[PDB]
Ligand binder design. Sequence first.
Ligand SMILES: CC(=O)N1C[C@@H](C)Oc2c(F)cccc21
Ligand SMILES: [Cl-]
Ligand SMILES: [Cl-]
Ligand SMILES: [Cl-]
Length: 163
Amino acid sequence: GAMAPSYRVKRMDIAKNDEECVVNAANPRGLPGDGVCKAVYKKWPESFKNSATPVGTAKTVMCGTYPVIHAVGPNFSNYTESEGDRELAAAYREVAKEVTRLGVNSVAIPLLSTGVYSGGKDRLTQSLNHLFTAMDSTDADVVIYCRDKEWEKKISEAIQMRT
Ligand SMILES: CC(=O)N1C[C@@H](C)Oc2c(F)cccc21
Ligand SMILES: [Cl-]
Ligand SMILES: [Cl-]
Ligand SMILES: [Cl-]
């Protein structure tokens, strides 16, 4: 475990993370994809061997000894708000199981279903609250990665509100 488990947020490419493992915002078919998924494919392509997994699940594949946890959030274009909310919560619970199983002291994580799977809606708060619900019982240092300057401020505010 971390000596004083924390949450942090950084605005940069998650392919440049300084953590012991990464969470990919994966598609269900293990394809290179776009956004975070394409960055992850360029950095850790070996981790896409048999990485296909259903919506609401996570599947870990090692790139050398570096664990890539492929977490499949729902595409809100296809799911109802109700069913998508349930699957997005479930993907983060499976991430927390994997982080625990791996025994890592730190994990880099993007906000699932906030980009091309958002169905064109702002889901920062919805996705971050499901992240906290899953990760709060883990003792890994969590570092959240984002690309937008205003999202950085809002994620940082939400972290500091609870401390
Ligand atoms: C830049 C912004 O506000 N974002 C985050 C970005 C990754 O994607 C989005 C989206 F698909 C739908 C609504 C908002 C956003
Ligand atoms: Cl960067
Ligand atoms: Cl997405
Ligand atoms: Cl972002």
